[model samples]
Target: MRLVVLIVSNDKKLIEEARKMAEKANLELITVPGSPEEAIRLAQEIAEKAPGPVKVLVLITGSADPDEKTKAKKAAEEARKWNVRVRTVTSPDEAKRWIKEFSEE
Candidate 1:
């Protein structure tokens, strides 16, 4: 099983922290530029390749631009249609927790 986190933000610090967290959990972290069509496609691909279940973490920062919002919404919609479970995070800590939970499951 692989834990996939699709973060949708430009925060370098948070992204770095997320990577560390995933590494600690021994999970794979796949990051896309933003929550857009291409990102969704990548996430879908990961989901398909995952042997068991793929856990997606979508981080939406309040400081995101309009374009980011549009991408996030599209990703969210697409994720809902997929069989994989996605956890939407507003902070790095939340993302860490979600990843941990997914690993446990």
Candidate 2:
């Protein structure tokens, strides 16, 4: 099965940890350092190309801007229409666990 994990964040440590966990889980981790709009666009593009399932992991930060939040909401809406699962996490561990479980499913 093909799995894609779109991580929307700018944290290097978090992205690195997610990359490690995703590798173990046999998932493709796409790290996004730009705006939420770009993140969602990339995610949708990946989902479009994926032959199987797609999972998007949006990292929520304490300093998230309103526009970012709006963009995330828009992504979630679009994901649903595209039959993609959207999961939001605040920590690397949470994301790792979710990815592992989702991959198993």
Candidate 3:
């Protein structure tokens, strides 16, 4: 299984940390824009282009607005239709752990 990590965050520090973790895991890292719509669109593209099973890791700072959350949820559901595994994480540690688990699997 191949991993394609999509990190969406406004914090520069968080983005740096997430990128480093992804590098350490040797996973493909895609830093997505903060906009939910853009992130979803990028995810769809990644899913379509992935050569094999791809795992997506979305990192957020905090709870998103209801509308954004709904959009993200819908996007994830759509990605699932393509057999993409999508997960949202609030912290770099959690994201790193999830990546490690996916790598192991």
Candidate 4:
């Protein structure tokens, strides 16, 4: 099995949901509160020297805000340069789905 990590913020409700999903899915989740860019940096640092295995970095943000979504997009794109599977999702459902999808491959 590969490593799965999630960066979520900009939505409190989503955070709680993702936390539960992470536990159930056995994934690692990080809360950056209001900054998606910082999340990217963290992901990059972690990915640059990821301990091992198939690893994926997923970013989850609120769907209600277009600005946050764009930021998350940029964050994800930047993190991908480290050569890891990075994805941006709006909801925990989508996040969980993405995690499952990536793990299966």
Clashes of each: 1, 0, 0, 0
Model 2 lDDT-worst window of ten:
55-64
Prediction 1 global C-alpha lDDT: 0.66
Error of 3 at 28 (Å): 0.9
* Candidate 1 residue spans exceeding 4 A from truth: 63-71, 85-88
Query: Comparing 3 and 4 by TM-score, which wins?
Result: 3
Q: Candidate 3, overall lDDT?
A: 0.70
Candidate 4: 10-residue stretch with minimal lDDT:
56-65
Give the Cα-based TM-score of candidate 3 against the true structure: 0.80
What are the per-residue Cα lDDT tens digits for candidate 3 across 1-105? 666777776767667777787788787777777666577677778778878767665554456789878887887788677555556678767766766776656
Model 2 agreement with the true structure over 52-89: per-residue lDDT tens digits: 75565544433458887787788779877665666667
lDDT tens digits, residue span 16-73, model 4: 7666666776776667655666666777776666666546566655442677668767
lDDT of each: 0.66, 0.71, 0.70, 0.63
Cα-based RMSD of candidate 3: 2.0
Q: After superposition, which runs of candidate 4 have C-alpha atoms over 4 Å from their true positions?
A: 10-12, 63-75
Cα RMSD, each candidate = 2.8, 2.2, 2.0, 3.3
The weakest ten consecutive residues by lDDT in model 3 span 54-63
Q: Which pairs of residues clash in candidate 4, taking residues 3 or more apart in a chain or in different chains?
A: none
Error of 4 at 51 (Å): 2.2
